[PDB]
Amino acid sequence: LNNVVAVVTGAAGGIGRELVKAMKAANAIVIATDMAPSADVEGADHYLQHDVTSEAGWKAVAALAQEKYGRVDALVHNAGISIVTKFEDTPLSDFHRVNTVNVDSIIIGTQVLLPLLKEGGKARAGGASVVNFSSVAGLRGAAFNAAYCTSKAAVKMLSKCLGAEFAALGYNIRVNSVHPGGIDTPMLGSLMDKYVELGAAPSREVAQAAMEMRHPIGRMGRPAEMGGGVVYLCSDAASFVTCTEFVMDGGFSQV
Amino acid sequence: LNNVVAVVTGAAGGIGRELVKAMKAANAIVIATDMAPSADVEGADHYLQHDVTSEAGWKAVAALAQEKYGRVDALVHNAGISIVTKFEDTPLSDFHRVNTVNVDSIIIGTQVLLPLLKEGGKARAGGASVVNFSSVAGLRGAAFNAAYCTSKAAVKMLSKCLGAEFAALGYNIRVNSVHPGGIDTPMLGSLMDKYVELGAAPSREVAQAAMEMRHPIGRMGRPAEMGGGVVYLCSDAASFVTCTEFVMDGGFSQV
Amino acid sequence: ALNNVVAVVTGAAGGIGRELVKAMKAANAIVIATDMAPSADVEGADHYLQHDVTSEAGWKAVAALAQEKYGRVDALVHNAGISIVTKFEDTPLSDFHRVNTVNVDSIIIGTQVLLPLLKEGGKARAGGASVVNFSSVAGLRGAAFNAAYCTSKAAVKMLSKCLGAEFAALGYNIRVNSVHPGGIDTPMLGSLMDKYVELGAAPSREVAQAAMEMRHPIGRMGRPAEMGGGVVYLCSDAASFVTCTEFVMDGGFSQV
Amino acid sequence: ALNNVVAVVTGAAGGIGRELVKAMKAANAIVIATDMAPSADVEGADHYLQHDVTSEAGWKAVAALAQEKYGRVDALVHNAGISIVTKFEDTPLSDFHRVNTVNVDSIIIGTQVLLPLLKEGGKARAGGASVVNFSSVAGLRGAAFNAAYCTSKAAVKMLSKCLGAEFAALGYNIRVNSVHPGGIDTPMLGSLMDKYVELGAAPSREVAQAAMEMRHPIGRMGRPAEMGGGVVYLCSDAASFVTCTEFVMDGGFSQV
């Protein structure tokens, strides 16, 4: 990932934090972001208090990189929220509230960074790499998981839309969705806990008697293994990778 | 489909009326609902003017089935929109306008027809049949169908999540998904005008053939051909057909 | 709807074998049910023939009748299946080959011998002649102790769409549809778990059946009867435009 | 991280095969490259062998070189391919079988005989060893005049969701993965578009060439070289939690 201007949202969460530091490990010129003021950022040159649900937010991202590097050669649409809760008890406003961050996190972003992710596509042979974080829960939907699965199913599909159309409009901006599994983040630290609140679990360790084993590979993911193809995608390695479904899920779904 | 109190939104759609007709030879009690005040909706047995995202509107359709029968066996949504648009020029409103008529017509409407749906699986062994139309475009990427495909993707996914959640909470309601290709409808129609106005297809003759040749069946799907697959869905012959990418394309996808 | 439809169903004296015939006759299309059984008590099945489905000499004899007796086939039904449950490391090469042979080659030879009698299907119903390839969720998804089995099914799976696409824009009118049945109750499936326990993967045959049923959101397995109308539908012309399809009748099992 | 990783590589003299080699020694992993070709100057490759993959002999020709010289296999590769286009109704079952053993059996004795060293390959390495099989677009979506091919590449796809799932639930650390490439311009994929005239698929050769080009949302025909990158990933332990799943390098083809 040499001479590549990047950016990554949500990179102060479990997966987020690593993606920045293992993208300077990739030696890409990262810019980090998160909802928060400012704290400890490793590798990344610059940070922005960011919420992928804030249009004005995003501009600040464009105008920065604009001055800062004058191009954008990567984009990891990452920041997103996972929720588990009774459907005939969930409002429509909850349903949007998920999409807001997970789906319309991708769009307003990439619309704002569109003048930029142009320039970046041109100055590299492989292209401007665009990475959306869907899931396995966007591949296979889950029970009591209704609005969380429809999120990553759009984060599945929007990608195809973004690769093929951008290809259409000439641009060389590769787009590719991302499909993790039941990642060990403190988010999921209290999401099995929410399978409990819906009865399907006597205790927290009996729902944590499902997620690892729905994986053949037999264990909760770790937020380390996830950067490996993320750099890959962003780099002229995956030059010929568009529209794709990049899946790292312990063989969760195949089975 | 004996003793089938069944609901058919957008019954004045190209596909709409022909499902209405093709459920009568099966001998079902149809309920035609649409945006129009009253037309000659051929086949139906009770007609409503029905805004498909109006919450209190699905309470006038839950009203009648409650009135006349006190059960809902089948639930078929249909009123589904497609914009053709330049992704970077697309309003988010208009992105927000499609998830609403389509994806968000399920989250509301089922809840209001849910009371009479848990009745269906008690009145019928083969259960209660909920059919959100998805489509091929909500399976696979299609540029300048940028705000249309993501929709039916969740329409693809939720179907799953609902159907799964209901069966996990021992409702006898199954939920499937129909995925028609470029169906000889006034929807497959004048969107080839949009393509044209985009200046994206040269002519409709071109546009016709691009949507003709992506099916190696050559023809683009007659609305009554989808009749069979709907019927099967509703029946107790489809009592093991839940949460399915049961297809009807003529060859748009698998190749 | 099955009118005028001369059909060939294999594995007829099987479970899903018996039932397919029943429902097709219940729609009232001329079944020509076939199996390896020397003779078979099959409700309605207008015909019965000892037919080895790997054997060419087999489909020959199928075709003799279907020509002489109707001079066409309107619905070819490869239901003829075996299942092999075994560790890849221990699975002989030929075990792989015995399976594919019976479940893919079986299918291949007759869509080649009965292909003549299918081209008239191209003619006798505009709604094409209905090829009904029985894959499975093994054809859909993967499994431990089902190596050769799933691979075999996924050839069936794929062969279908090859035949959906070829037989189409060659003018031949023939739809090829792929049924992928989920857990279906037979002294086939009611004993395919034994093996996992025979291996020892599961302690008991109760537990063999446990996660079996629960791996479908619906929570149970399938009736032989609950595999009925899906063939009928494919063989019904309500779907003249429905080919290359994985017709998934598994109880959502795959999708979640 | 392709360091202290002993590979094995088939279809070596093949055009992609060659790209795959360079792009893995310039990552500093320990190559054992294999092919049937009599003579091969396989750039990057530490060792070349003359190997028949429809042969446990050929496969135990590999095994000794990894037996004697090293003591493990960390990245076995199965890269051989035949790419037949045939009329379904002009494929003998033999021509069906020829495209089995080179394409599917090759992966079996590759993985039955090398299984010990795959295990030994999975002990020093974190997320484990990987088998990174080579299917094809054909192996996922369908296409005409690829009957025996698109199956053969489907019988890859699935075999490996079998093999992925069977080893992990065996307490080995020996991952199994697959790629499905799109249109890669090679002499391997060379004048095969002539066939799409000898039958009559599209008028000429260069509009058959651009007919293949058309489909691709990416717009262009890939390169042999491009595969290697998405092969250099899967093998490394930074692609540890990638198993059973179908890593895709097609250029958008499948996705629209």
Side-chain angles (χ1 to χ4, degrees):
Chain A
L1 258 188
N2 293 335
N3 309 315
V4 166
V5 189
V7 173
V8 192
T9 57
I15 299 165
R17 277 217 288 279
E18 281 292 68
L19 284 181
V20 161
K21 300 156 194 179
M23 265 162 87
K24 281 278 300 206
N27 295 260
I29 324 149
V30 173
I31 300 161
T33 58
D34 204 310
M35 300 163 104
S38 53
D40 167 15
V41 169
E42 171 184 8
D45 307 43
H46 321 270
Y47 166 83
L48 280 88
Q49 203 151 5
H50 193 168
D51 170 29
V52 278
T53 66
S54 173
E55 174 189 11
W58 267 108
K59 304 215 159 192
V61 170
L64 190 106
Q66 170 70 66
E67 167 207 329
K68 269 293 181 181
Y69 300 98
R71 50 194 292 166
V72 176
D73 298 84
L75 159 62
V76 184
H77 282 284
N78 169 67
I81 59 165
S82 169
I83 288 180
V84 176
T85 190
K86 308 171 180 186
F87 144 73
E88 48 201 22
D89 287 284
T90 302
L92 199 100
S93 42
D94 267 2
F95 189 103
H96 299 187
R97 205 194 76 119
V98 182
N99 312 301
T100 296
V101 187
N102 306 11
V103 173
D104 295 36
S105 111
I106 292 168
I107 320 171
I108 316 170
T110 313
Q111 282 169 347
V112 155
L113 300 194
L114 155 97
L116 285 183
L117 290 142
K118 274 161 192 164
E119 280 291 306
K122 268 180 153 199
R124 284 174 60 195
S129 185
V130 175
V131 170
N132 308 349
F133 270 66
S134 169
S135 163
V136 284
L139 279 193
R140 66 184 263 212
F144 311 128
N145 290 261
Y148 173 52
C149 296
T150 50
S151 61
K152 302 314 181 188
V155 190
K156 197 179 99 157
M157 166 55 63
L158 184 73
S159 298
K160 311 186 183 187
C161 294
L162 287 197
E165 195 167 327
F166 286 26
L169 325 183
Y171 322 118
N172 174 49
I173 309 177
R174 301 166 301 143
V175 185
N176 301 286
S177 48
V178 170
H179 318 265
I183 275 283
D184 167 62
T185 46
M187 174 219 57
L188 206 88
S190 70
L191 275 178
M192 283 164 202
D193 310 16
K194 306 303 188 176
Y195 285 131
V196 175
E197 290 182 352
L198 308 182
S203 72
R204 191 165 168 178
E205 312 84 28
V206 178
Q208 192 191 7
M211 163 68 61
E212 308 174 40
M213 262 188 306
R214 296 174 191 186
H215 287 71
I217 207 165
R219 68 166 204 48
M220 249 196 322
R222 310 169 330 193
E225 316 164 280
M226 279 317 100
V230 174
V231 168
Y232 165 56
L233 279 169
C234 299
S235 36
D236 280 20
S239 58
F240 187 61
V241 186
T242 187
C243 294
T244 198
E245 289 196 357
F246 196 70
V247 178
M248 299 183 66
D249 60 350
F252 183 93
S253 48
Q254 331 316 321
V255 287
Chain B
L1 267 179
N2 269 354
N3 301 295
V4 167
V5 173
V7 198
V8 199
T9 87
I15 302 167
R17 265 213 262 283
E18 286 303 322
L19 297 186
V20 175
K21 299 189 192 191
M23 270 184 86
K24 285 302 287 182
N27 303 266
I29 305 166
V30 172
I31 313 151
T33 66
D34 203 276
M35 281 200 70
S38 61
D40 180 2
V41 172
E42 172 173 348
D45 299 307
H46 280 273
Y47 180 82
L48 287 89
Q49 187 184 16
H50 180 206
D51 189 332
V52 275
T53 51
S54 171
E55 155 237 326
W58 292 69
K59 300 186 180 176
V61 172
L64 224 85
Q66 182 75 81
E67 168 187 339
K68 311 275 171 184
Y69 314 104
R71 66 185 285 185
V72 171
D73 322 320
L75 176 67
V76 166
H77 313 263
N78 208 63
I81 41 162
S82 173
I83 307 174
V84 161
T85 174
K86 312 172 157 189
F87 176 72
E88 77 206 67
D89 294 277
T90 312
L92 208 91
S93 78
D94 298 344
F95 217 111
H96 284 177
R97 182 163 46 111
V98 159
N99 249 286
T100 284
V101 176
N102 311 346
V103 177
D104 295 16
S105 67
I106 307 167
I107 322 158
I108 304 162
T110 293
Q111 290 186 2
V112 186
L113 294 161
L114 196 80
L116 295 178
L117 268 169
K118 304 171 206 185
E119 300 271 49
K122 309 166 181 164
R124 301 174 68 199
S129 162
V130 181
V131 167
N132 314 287
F133 265 47
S134 194
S135 186
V136 306
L139 274 167
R140 57 115 278 170
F144 291 153
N145 293 278
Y148 165 48
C149 301
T150 10
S151 78
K152 305 287 192 188
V155 167
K156 170 214 52 157
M157 176 54 71
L158 182 67
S159 283
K160 309 167 196 153
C161 306
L162 296 186
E165 194 162 64
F166 295 12
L169 284 192
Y171 301 162
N172 216 42
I173 308 159
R174 312 168 280 105
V175 188
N176 296 314
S177 42
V178 181
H179 293 253
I183 296 297
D184 204 14
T185 57
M187 196 202 83
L188 166 82
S190 84
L191 279 199
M192 281 192 196
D193 307 12
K194 299 275 200 195
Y195 280 134
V196 148
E197 292 144 352
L198 292 203
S203 67
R204 189 159 175 171
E205 294 95 18
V206 184
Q208 199 179 340
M211 177 65 93
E212 273 156 350
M213 281 160 331
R214 272 170 177 174
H215 304 71
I217 179 169
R219 58 203 157 73
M220 283 186 314
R222 267 176 274 204
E225 292 182 284
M226 298 315 92
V230 158
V231 167
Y232 178 77
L233 276 193
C234 316
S235 69
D236 326 289
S239 50
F240 199 73
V241 177
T242 201
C243 309
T244 171
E245 323 208 43
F246 159 35
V247 218
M248 283 144 95
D249 75 351
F252 194 93
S253 52
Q254 304 297 343
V255 291
Chain C
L2 271 185
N3 289 351
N4 313 283
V5 169
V6 181
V8 175
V9 175
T10 69
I16 298 176
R18 293 182 183 174
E19 266 306 292
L20 290 194
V21 169
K22 286 185 198 176
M24 289 186 76
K25 270 298 292 189
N28 297 277
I30 300 163
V31 186
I32 304 177
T34 57
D35 190 285
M36 268 225 85
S39 86
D41 183 15
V42 161
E43 179 185 344
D46 297 64
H47 296 303
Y48 187 64
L49 275 85
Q50 193 162 33
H51 166 200
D52 194 4
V53 307
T54 43
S55 146
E56 188 174 27
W59 282 114
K60 278 186 160 186
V62 165
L65 194 88
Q67 165 84 92
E68 198 182 308
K69 287 267 159 184
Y70 308 94
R72 51 203 264 238
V73 179
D74 296 275
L76 169 63
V77 176
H78 291 294
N79 161 67
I82 54 176
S83 171
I84 274 192
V85 175
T86 170
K87 291 188 180 177
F88 164 75
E89 55 186 45
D90 310 314
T91 301
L93 194 72
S94 80
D95 257 48
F96 195 109
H97 274 180
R98 191 173 65 119
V99 173
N100 262 273
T101 289
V102 164
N103 307 319
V104 159
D105 274 19
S106 54
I107 292 180
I108 285 172
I109 298 178
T111 311
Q112 292 182 350
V113 182
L114 289 171
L115 182 83
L117 298 164
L118 279 170
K119 292 172 160 200
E120 278 299 305
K123 306 202 163 193
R125 309 136 65 170
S130 180
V131 184
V132 166
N133 296 331
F134 255 49
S135 188
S136 185
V137 257
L140 275 187
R141 39 169 280 188
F145 327 111
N146 286 320
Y149 176 52
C150 304
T151 57
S152 68
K153 286 280 185 183
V156 188
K157 152 169 75 175
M158 167 59 60
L159 182 44
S160 304
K161 313 147 186 164
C162 307
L163 291 228
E166 194 150 277
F167 282 174
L170 292 156
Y172 304 169
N173 175 25
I174 293 160
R175 303 191 284 102
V176 175
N177 314 299
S178 48
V179 177
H180 297 227
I184 304 299
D185 186 27
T186 29
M188 164 201 71
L189 197 87
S191 50
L192 271 178
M193 290 152 221
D194 318 343
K195 323 291 166 158
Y196 292 105
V197 164
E198 293 167 21
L199 293 157
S204 70
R205 189 172 185 181
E206 294 101 342
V207 169
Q209 182 172 358
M212 140 75 54
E213 281 175 340
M214 261 197 319
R215 295 179 197 178
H216 319 57
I218 194 156
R220 75 143 157 61
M221 282 179 321
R223 240 220 291 174
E226 274 198 308
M227 293 271 95
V231 179
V232 193
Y233 170 57
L234 300 177
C235 304
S236 79
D237 264 7
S240 59
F241 183 74
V242 182
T243 169
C244 312
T245 158
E246 316 159 9
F247 201 86
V248 178
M249 288 149 68
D250 70 352
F253 164 101
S254 47
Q255 284 291 317
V256 318
Chain D
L2 262 198
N3 288 334
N4 303 286
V5 179
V6 178
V8 183
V9 175
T10 73
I16 298 170
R18 292 201 307 298
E19 305 306 290
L20 303 179
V21 165
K22 310 187 186 186
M24 273 166 93
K25 273 292 302 176
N28 303 326
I30 316 160
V31 164
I32 306 167
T34 52
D35 197 289
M36 289 207 76
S39 58
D41 179 339
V42 183
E43 192 213 334
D46 302 309
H47 311 310
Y48 172 63
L49 275 91
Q50 191 170 338
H51 170 194
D52 196 358
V53 287
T54 68
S55 195
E56 185 193 8
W59 273 117
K60 288 183 152 163
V62 165
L65 185 68
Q67 172 61 104
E68 167 218 319
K69 276 290 181 175
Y70 312 107
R72 55 187 281 228
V73 178
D74 301 291
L76 158 62
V77 180
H78 311 265
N79 177 80
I82 59 169
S83 179
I84 298 200
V85 166
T86 181
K87 252 202 174 178
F88 177 78
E89 56 227 67
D90 311 317
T91 322
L93 209 71
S94 79
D95 250 346
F96 251 83
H97 288 160
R98 185 161 69 146
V99 185
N100 258 294
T101 324
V102 169
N103 291 40
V104 189
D105 279 7
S106 81
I107 305 172
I108 304 178
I109 321 148
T111 315
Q112 267 189 309
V113 152
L114 288 191
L115 168 72
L117 287 188
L118 292 170
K119 288 175 209 134
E120 254 283 314
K123 287 185 152 197
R125 286 175 78 220
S130 192
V131 172
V132 186
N133 282 318
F134 276 79
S135 158
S136 184
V137 274
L140 272 170
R141 68 138 272 185
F145 315 119
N146 304 294
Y149 181 39
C150 298
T151 41
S152 65
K153 281 322 190 185
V156 160
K157 170 173 70 174
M158 173 51 75
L159 171 63
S160 305
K161 304 187 173 194
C162 300
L163 297 192
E166 210 168 88
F167 291 160
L170 275 193
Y172 322 133
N173 185 19
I174 320 160
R175 295 193 270 100
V176 194
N177 284 289
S178 73
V179 190
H180 309 254
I184 300 299
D185 170 354
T186 53
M188 165 217 111
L189 214 85
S191 66
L192 270 164
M193 283 194 232
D194 284 343
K195 308 272 187 210
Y196 294 108
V197 197
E198 318 177 36
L199 321 180
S204 83
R205 185 199 198 223
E206 282 61 25
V207 164
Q209 203 172 9
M212 163 98 136
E213 285 158 3
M214 261 210 302
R215 311 152 179 186
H216 283 85
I218 196 149
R220 66 178 194 72
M221 255 210 305
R223 289 181 290 134
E226 277 159 302
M227 298 308 112
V231 186
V232 198
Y233 155 77
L234 273 183
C235 291
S236 70
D237 277 349
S240 48
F241 205 88
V242 194
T243 180
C244 310
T245 169
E246 305 158 7
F247 173 132
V248 172
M249 291 164 96
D250 69 338
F253 177 90
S254 71
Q255 291 311 287
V256 308

